[PDB]
Amino acid sequence: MAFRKSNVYLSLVNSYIIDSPQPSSINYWWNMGSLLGLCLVIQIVTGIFMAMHYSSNIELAFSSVEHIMRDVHNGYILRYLHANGASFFFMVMFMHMAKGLYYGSYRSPRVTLWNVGVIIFILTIATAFLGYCCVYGQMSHWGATVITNLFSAIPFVGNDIVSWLWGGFSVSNPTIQRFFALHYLVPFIIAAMVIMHLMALHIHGSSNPLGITGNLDRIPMHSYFIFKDLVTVFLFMLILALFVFYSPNTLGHPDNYIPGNPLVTPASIVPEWYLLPFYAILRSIPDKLLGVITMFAAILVLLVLPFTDRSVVRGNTFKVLSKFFFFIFVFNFVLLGQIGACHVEVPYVLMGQIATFIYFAYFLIIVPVISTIENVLFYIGRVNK
Amino acid sequence: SLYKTFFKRNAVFVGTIFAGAFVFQTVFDTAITSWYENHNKGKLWKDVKARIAA
Amino acid sequence: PQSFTSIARIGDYILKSPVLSKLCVPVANQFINLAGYKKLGLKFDDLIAEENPIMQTALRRLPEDESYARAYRIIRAHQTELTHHLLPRNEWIKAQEDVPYLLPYILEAEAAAKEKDELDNIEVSK
Amino acid sequence: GPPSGKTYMGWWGHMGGPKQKGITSYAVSPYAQKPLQGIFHNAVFNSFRRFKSQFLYVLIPAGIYWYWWKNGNEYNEFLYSKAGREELERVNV
Amino acid sequence: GPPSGKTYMGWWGHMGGPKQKGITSYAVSPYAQKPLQGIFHNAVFNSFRRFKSQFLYVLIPAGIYWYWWKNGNEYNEFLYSKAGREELERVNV
Amino acid sequence: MTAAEHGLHAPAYAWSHNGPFETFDHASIRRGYQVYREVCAACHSLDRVAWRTLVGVSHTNEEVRNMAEEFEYDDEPDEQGNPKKRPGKLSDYIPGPYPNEQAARAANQGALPPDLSLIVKARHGGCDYIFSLLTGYPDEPPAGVALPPGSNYNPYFPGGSIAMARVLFDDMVEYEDGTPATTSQMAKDVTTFLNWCAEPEHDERKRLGLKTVIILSSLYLLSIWVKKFKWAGIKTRKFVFNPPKPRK
Amino acid sequence: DRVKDPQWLIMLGICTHLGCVPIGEAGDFGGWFCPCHGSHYDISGRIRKGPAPLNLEIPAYEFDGDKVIVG
Numbered sequence A: 001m002a003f004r005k006s007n008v009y010l011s012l013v014n015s016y017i018i019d020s021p022q023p024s025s026i027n028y029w030w031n032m033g034s035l036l037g038l039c040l041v042i043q044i045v046t047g048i049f050m051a052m053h054y055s056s057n058i059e060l061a062f063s064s065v066e067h068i069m070r071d072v073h074n075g076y077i078l079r080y081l082h083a084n085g086a087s088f089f090f091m092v093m094f095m096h097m098a099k100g101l102y103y104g105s106y107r108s109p110r111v112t113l114w115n116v117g118v119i120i121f122i123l124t125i126a127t128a129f130l131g132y133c134c135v136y137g138q139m140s141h142w143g144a145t146v147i148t149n150l151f152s153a154i155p156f157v158g159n160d161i162v163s164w165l166w167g168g169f170s171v172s173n174p175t176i177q178r179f180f181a182l183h184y185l186v187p188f189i190i191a192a193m194v195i196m197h198l199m200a201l202h203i204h205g206s207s208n209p210l211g212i213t214g215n216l217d218r219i220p221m222h223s224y225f226i227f228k229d230l231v232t233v234f235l236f237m238l239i240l241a242l243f244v245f246y247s248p249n250t251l252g253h254p255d256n257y258i259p260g261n262p263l264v265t266p267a268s269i270v271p272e273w274y275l276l277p278f279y280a281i282l283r284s285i286p287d288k289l290l291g292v293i294t295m296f297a298a299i300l301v302l303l304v305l306p307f308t309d310r311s312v313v314r315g316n317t318f319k320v321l322s323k324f325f326f327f328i329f330v331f332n333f334v335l336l337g338q339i340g341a342c343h344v345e346v347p348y349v350l351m352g353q354i355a356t357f358i359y360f361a362y363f364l365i366i367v368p369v370i371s372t373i374e375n376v377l378f379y380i381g382r383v384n385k
Numbered sequence B: 001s002l003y004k005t006f007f008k009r010n011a012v013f014v015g016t017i018f019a020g021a022f023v024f025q026t027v028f029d030t031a032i033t034s035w036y037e038n039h040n041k042g043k044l045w046k047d048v049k050a051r052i053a054a
Numbered sequence C: 001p002q003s004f005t006s007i008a009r010i011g012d013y014i015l016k017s018p019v020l021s022k023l024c025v026p027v028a029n030q031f032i033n034l035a036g037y038k039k040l041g042l043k044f045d046d047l048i049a050e051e052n053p054i055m056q057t058a059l060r061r062l063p064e065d066e067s068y069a070r071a072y073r074i075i076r077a078h079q080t081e082l083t084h085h086l087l088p089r090n091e092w093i094k095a096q097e098d099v100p101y102l103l104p105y106i107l108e109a110e111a112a113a114k115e116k117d118e119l120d121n122i123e124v125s126k
Numbered sequence D, E: 001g002p003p004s005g006k007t008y009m010g011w012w013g014h015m016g017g018p019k020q021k022g023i024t025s026y027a028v029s030p031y032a033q034k035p036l037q038g039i040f041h042n043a044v045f046n047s048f049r050r051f052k053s054q055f056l057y058v059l060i061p062a063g064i065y066w067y068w069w070k071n072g073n074e075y076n077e078f079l080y081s082k083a084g085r086e087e088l089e090r091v092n093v
Numbered sequence F: 001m002t003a004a005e006h007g008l009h010a011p012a013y014a015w016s017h018n019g020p021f022e023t024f025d026h027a028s029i030r031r032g033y034q035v036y037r038e039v040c041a042a043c044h045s046l047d048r049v050a051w052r053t054l055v056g057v058s059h060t061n062e063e064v065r066n067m068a069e070e071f072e073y074d075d076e077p078d079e080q081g082n083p084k085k086r087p088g089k090l091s092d093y094i095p096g097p098y099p100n101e102q103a104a105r106a107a108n109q110g111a112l113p114p115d116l117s118l119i120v121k122a123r124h125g126g127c128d129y130i131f132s133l134l135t136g137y138p139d140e141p142p143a144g145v146a147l148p149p150g151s152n153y154n155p156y157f158p159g160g161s162i163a164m165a166r167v168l169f170d171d172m173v174e175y176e177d178g179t180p181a182t183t184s185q186m187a188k189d190v191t192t193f194l195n196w197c198a199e200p201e202h203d204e205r206k207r208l209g210l211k212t213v214i215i216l217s218s219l220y221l222l223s224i225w226v227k228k229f230k231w232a233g234i235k236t237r238k239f240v241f242n243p244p245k246p247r248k
Numbered sequence G: 001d002r003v004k005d006p007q008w009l010i011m012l013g014i015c016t017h018l019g020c021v022p023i024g025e026a027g028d029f030g031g032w033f034c035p036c037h038g039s040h041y042d043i044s045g046r047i048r049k050g051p052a053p054l055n056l057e058i059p060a061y062e063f064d065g066d067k068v069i070v071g
């Protein structure tokens, strides 16, 4: 046989990116996976070449970031690529998970793939939070303080857990040093989970935007989806180059260029832009413990998703009401982000509570009821009696 | 067949790619530097150095 | 995960009642022709996901000619979705051709699996 | 190597679909094919078809949530002004 | 999955050795077997057999290199002493 | 919050360095440094700006050297361990007027004057906010506002009450080039200078952005062509189906 | 219940609403005044007027003679 098939190392390269049978009807929404892989490689390479100049002391963190942006040759390129690419990493990941919810890729036989995806999502949120605290600006310090006090809400144990996390009594030098070590560490766990994700994908192949089988008309990976992914790679690099070179500090928060001061609290403490729906979910609950439980349940309710989709056809392509309520859900998630960006003021508390309820109601009540009604409507539309 | 022997061997094909990329880097760098200085005439530092003659 | 016996029971309860049928059969076929699976040249039994062993059984049950027709409808649907067009109006699946052809094979596999599970969990008449 | 479980995708030759017969393909080489002949008239009329069949499912949720956000933001900037400070007093307590 | 090349180890059932016939195994359960019955007399006589057949291939290179290292180290600490300083002068130049 | 705690919205001034192609006005940066040194530098440190960054940007080599040699820095101690001073050089940083935080809070009624190395990048609005902050002091606060004594009013500061004094008056500095140095002129010059101090890469960032956007747009269109090319065998593929003989 | 010695007031600066720093010898009540949202604080460290929900926390401190250890 061929050398790409008989060699031990090149057989994986073959069976994953050369001769992988892909369904020939998949559109550009089946390209966000390759795009996330490229953006992860961007994050790791800029992280290494920018962490060769970073000193993680609490008295030397912000000065070393400014040393990167001023004294290091092309260091502004590195930091701006790194922060804005983390923003694009979460945006492409949100689009990828929306592709997962829409076309029904969570359903059987792809439950393992969906669960490893949710694990990757949790690890990526953790990585972004740790790296945002490594800047040690104003928002970095106070966001670390608020999230660890949320961990202090745990009954009978929590204060000692938080003194363990801090490595002291408040967010201090051991906290920033261990956040830098963990933040260097967790992306390699993300890379291992990505390899496990690709294995759980490869044992059944991709889905298709129709929700029927794709075993009939398969076309290879090579040259076809290689050049289709090359198209979206160049578009992604174009938009990233715009938001790096022409308007770099748009997505960030301007308070993060104030150095970390434990005495001055800011006027409005807000995380970076993508953690705002989860921050709104947590802020909508009038309790600390139930708030933390609801914030983690807002990700575990993605795990309870394949067991509630009672639709007998895969994906929302050929269904009306499920497609409508899907876009209700997407614009609700955007409204959660925008509620979280605001203050704790009338009527944003009541709207945050209603928006959290519509989030959990979509994942727990709306999907099974609308899928059951859509099944019975498909049946009685064509069966006569 | 007039140009296909210029494309037939892959060696001369990638040699053309690398020679043209070398020429493109040089010419494109010089041209974008010249246009970016021409668009902002009167604001760069050599203009102020020429104006402030003291 | 609807267990076709259940949807068949609900649909037959709707169809056998005159008031419910007169109320929600126009809503039903309005939902069908807004769904737009006809326009890709498909039938609804071509659209049920077949990656569970009971539906895989009901596809082994199927006669040959209907299996080749189903394979052609799937390949023309993939090609039409690939070109991002629709099939011309002469090639759309009409309302009379949208026959529930695979439903009885699915229902007999449902009854077989249900009976196997019941007999696998019986008591004894003491 | 060990055997593995039954998957729903095989490989080239034993892919696992149903047996098919009498279905013939026809394709032409792209060297004798003109690419992007279908960009003009296509990016107008097909794009309008793809917009018309598919916009309203996006436009009604955007309309609902944007109207609800706008009404909430207007009520915010009302009751933190001088005109609605007594209403802020009675709904904040 | 794709096929791979011919290896020299299969799996349980098709391992790839030669066909074998008329060769019978006999093994007893370790619950009815006494472990470490063969430590005493074994760690003396078998260990002396394993040392006797196998020591000299280790002992001759160790002897050669240790004698050569010792002669070199003795010559070092000779010529950096007071007695051999003129020899250090003539061999360092 | 009301609009008073949030502060008034700074408007959209048409700077000479907005837009994706316009660079800084380096004569304005030179005049902004002059207004900095003669007004701000009594009370604002500039701790992250080295002297060498001004060479070739707003001043020549000898000008930066003769401005840095007016200041004293800590030399390495002599052969008896006594601490000694030295005049500045190109590799040092611009020194602040205050030796520590407590001297700053003592000399400014408790309020700490923030370091202005990143102050146009650490405020929302940015350039417009700094300019409207400087030129925004009313002659007298609006009727009904009780200022705490020692504080001043301008609506652009969040809360209304700022601890700065109005420190831009008509012709308090003289310009080297003879530009009429009104308040708005000096405020525009220092805001351009602080934009340089926060973003010294700004010129090279925009020209490398021009190169990168041109090359990636060309690559994106070329890749669209090659994708439409190599998929042409699959877009135009056709299937006919005559149903087979049912006897088999 | 707030002090062990009425001669001395030693209180934490972590404010209950947002953690702001009140001004020493300021306000209308003779004690402290939060400049963030007007949480008026008395001479003993309690909220009277303002959105602060609870009173100011006293740290743990024990007497040792001519000093006080804090912790």
Ligand SMILES: CCCCCCCCCCCCCCCCCC(=O)OC[C@H](COP(=O)(O)OCCN)OC(=O)CCCCCCCCCCCCC
Pocket (backbone or CB within 6 Å): A029, A094, A095, A097, A098, A099, A102, A209, A298, A302, A316, A317, A318, A329, A330, A333, A334, D054, D057, D058
């Ligand atoms: C914690 C869990 C995380 C959950 C994340 C929730 C979502 C976060 C936001 C991500 C936005 C991504 C939305 C993408 C939606 C899924 C992709 C999709 O559904 O597109 C296909 C859809 C219908 O196409 P069909 O496949 O049905 O074609 C039928 C052919 N006969 O085509 C369409 O209907 C139109 C597609 C229009 C896309 C517009 C994107 C809108 C983005 C909203 C941003 C709002 C900013 C104001």
Ligand code: HEC
Pocket (backbone or CB within 6 Å): A040, A043, A044, A046, A047, A048, A050, A051, A054, A065, A079, A082, A083, A086, A087, A089, A124, A127, A128, A129, A131, A132, A133, A134, A135, A183, A184, A187, A190, A252
């Ligand atoms: C050393 C390896 C390294 C890796 C790998 C890495 N980063 Fe970072 N990241 C850093 C460093 C160092 C910083 C702090 C310096 C900075 O912010 O410029 C940082 C900062 C960040 C920031 C804050 C940027 C800012 O300035 O506000 C975010 C957000 C972030 N990382 C996200 C990610 C994500 C998401 C990934 C991958 C999934 C990732 N990082 C991988 C090194 C790394």
Ligand code: HEC
Pocket (backbone or CB within 6 Å): A029, A030, A031, A032, A033, A034, A036, A037, A040, A093, A096, A097, A099, A100, A103, A104, A105, A106, A113, A114, A116, A117, A118, A119, A120, A121, A194, A197, A201, A205, A206, A207, A208
């Ligand atoms: C929680 C959801 C989820 C997350 C998060 C997620 N994935 Fe996926 N991924 C999927 C699903 C579902 C599929 C299968 C697509 C389908 O339904 O056919 C998939 C498929 C893929 C594919 C195959 C190409 C494609 O578009 O399907 C790649 C590659 C991939 N994922 C990479 C990643 C990478 C890289 C990450 C982050 C590092 C990631 N995924 C995170 C759910 C997720």
Ligand code: HEC
Pocket (backbone or CB within 6 Å): F035, F036, F039, F040, F041, F042, F043, F044, F108, F111, F112, F113, F114, F119, F130, F133, F157, F161, F162, F163, F164, F165, F167, F190
């Ligand atoms: C009178 C002493 C004094 C002088 C002179 C002075 N400053 Fe300030 N400045 C301050 C103080 C004090 C603050 C902070 C006050 C506060 O936080 O309430 C300040 C704050 C600022 C701020 C930011 C204020 C904020 O709310 O973020 C800017 C910008 C600023 N100064 C610019 C300048 C510039 C430019 C000059 C020279 C042109 C200058 N200042 C000269 C005392 C001074």
Ligand SMILES: COc1c(O)c(C)c(C/C=C(\C)CC/C=C(\C)CC/C=C(/C)CC/C=C(\C)CC/C=C(\C)CCC=C(C)C)c(O)c1OC
Pocket (backbone or CB within 6 Å): A016, A017, A020, A022, A030, A031, A033, A034, A035, A037, A038, A040, A041, A044, A045, A048, A191, A194, A195, A198, A201, A206, A225, A229
């Ligand atoms: C379903 O069909 C598929 C499909 O099957 C596959 C496989 C893919 C492809 C998937 C991917 C490409 C994702 C793969 C991602 C990874 C394997 C993550 C690995 C990432 C890394 C960054 C590897 C780690 C390497 C390093 C850290 C090396 C960096 C070291 C440096 C820079 C050292 C520098 C120092 C000096 C001194 C030079 C698809 O996109 C796809 O859809 C079409």
Ligand SMILES: CCCCCCCCCCCCCCC(=O)O[C@H](COC(=O)CCCCCCCCCCCC)COP(=O)(O)O
Pocket (backbone or CB within 6 Å): A034, A035, A037, A038, A041, A223, A226, A229, A230, A233
């Ligand atoms: C690990 C990082 C993952 C990133 C995801 C990237 C997905 C797309 C990868 C594209 C690889 C293209 C190889 C195609 C090929 O070799 O075909 C080869 C030859 O094709 C070419 O020469 C393509 C021209 C050169 C394109 C160079 C693109 C480099 C920019 C890559 C930017 C992303 C790294 C085989 O082509 P053929 O079988 O049709 O004859």
Ligand SMILES: CCCCCCCCCCCCCCCCCC(=O)O[C@H](COC(=O)CCCCCC)COP(=O)(O)OCCN
Pocket (backbone or CB within 6 Å): A006, A007, A008, A009, A010, A012, A013, A195
């Ligand atoms: C957690 C997994 C992380 C990723 C690992 C899996 C993916 C690995 C992909 C590797 C792709 C690149 C490998 C191609 C190299 C092929 C050369 C080869 O196989 O020839 C090998 C010899 O290889 C070497 O000597 C060193 C290879 C080290 C590779 C270092 C990267 C010979 O192989 P073979 O026995 O089939 O040849 C018989 C001759 N006719």
Ligand SMILES: CCCCCCCCCCCCCC(=O)O[C@H](COC(=O)CCCCCCCCCCC)COP(=O)(O)O
Pocket (backbone or CB within 6 Å): A041, A042, A045, A077, A237, A240, A241, F208, F211, F212, F213, F215, F216
């Ligand atoms: C290692 C992964 C890095 C991927 C970066 C993608 C993000 C896009 C922004 C890139 C800007 C950084 C480069 C730059 O500033 O160049 C600028 C020019 O812009 C470009 O050419 C970028 C084009 C990107 C093409 C990507 C090719 C793929 C290479 C894969 C790695 C071998 C500066 O050019 P100059 O220093 O003057 O030579």
Ligand code: FES
Pocket (backbone or CB within 6 Å): G015, G016, G017, G018, G019, G020, G034, G036, G037, G038, G039, G050, G051, G052
């Ligand atoms: S801190 Fe805002 S009221 Fe006490």
